[PDB]
């Protein structure tokens, strides 16, 4: 009876080995806090070169037509896609591409990356969808409530314990802040990061501010289509 009881003590060691990891995470988190500062500032930093360059730019532009010469900004931006519209009155067609994005039901969500090819595939999907870039923060709010667990386990959520100790992650650090930074930057194997577990299952919008007309496009004045600003507003409502 004594000898297995000594085996139970060892469990106190396992109690240490992860905690040694906890300490590693605290450091990782401190470095990645400066990585957070960069994600926020980068968008702001782009704008500075235009601002620095041009006095000219603004006045001419409000008052009249024409454009001035010298510079121009390119932009990337990753996307989030939510299916507003149901299955009723549609071909299987477009449905099989939904199944491809992994929008299985209404109020399903999948993140997508920055490229022309996705967009073109997204065009067949289009009257399924509201889409756009949610900002750095709204995505943080998005993971916490809607995220789920991986295969080799069932659904187990994105909740606090489960991400820090668990979640597989071959490429890089799974931990809550690290994972979220890394998808948004859309660097190496962040497309493998965006092989989430699998769909975010969104609440219906509160107040129906998330529902402007299903009928309409952002150009008609509805919900449909690409819209950065509106998607962050929309996701907040999905809470």
């Amino acid at each position: 009876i004594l000898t297995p009881e000594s085996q139970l003590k060892k469990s106190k060691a396992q109690q240490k080995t992860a905690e040694q990891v906890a300490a590693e995470r605290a450091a990782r988190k401190a470095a990645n806090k400066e990585k957070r500062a960069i994600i926020l500032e980068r968008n702001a930093a782009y704008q500075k070169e235009y601002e620095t360059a041009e006095r000219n730019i603004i006045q001419a532009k409000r008052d009249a037509k024409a454009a001035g010469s010298y510079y121009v900004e390119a932009q990337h931006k990753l996307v989030f896609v939510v299916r507003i519209k149901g299955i009723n009155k549609i071909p299987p067609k477009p449905r099989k591409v939904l199944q491809l994005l992994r929008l299985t039901r209404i109020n399903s969500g999948t993140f997508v990356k920055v490229t022309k090819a996705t967009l073109e595939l997204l065009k067949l999907i289009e009257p399924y969808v509201a889409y756009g870039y949610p900002s750095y923060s709204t995505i943080r709010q998005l993971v916490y409530k809607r995220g789920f667990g991986k295969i080799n386990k069932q659904r187990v959520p994105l909740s606090d314990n489960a991400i820090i100790e668990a979640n597989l992650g071959k490429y890089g650090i799974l931990s809550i802040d690290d994972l979220i930074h890394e998808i948004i930057t859309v660097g190496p194997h962040f497309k493998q990061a965006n092989n989430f577990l699998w769909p975010f299952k969104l609440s219906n919008p509160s107040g129906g501010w998330g529902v402007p007309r299903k009928f309409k496009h952002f150009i008609q004045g509805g919900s449909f289509g690409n819209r950065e600003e509106f998607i962050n507003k929309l996701v907040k409502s999905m809470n």
């Binding site: 995470r25 605290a26 988190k29 187990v156 909740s159 606090d160 314990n161 820090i164 931990s175 809550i176």
Partner: peptide, 19 residues
């Protein structure tokens, strides 16, 4: 599991976000 903002569960979901 339904955790959040706390501060106590907001000690767990973080490290970083605490720093």
């Amino acid at each position: 599991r339904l955790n959040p903002y706390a501060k106590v569960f907001a000690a767990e979901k973080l490290g970083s976000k605490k720093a």
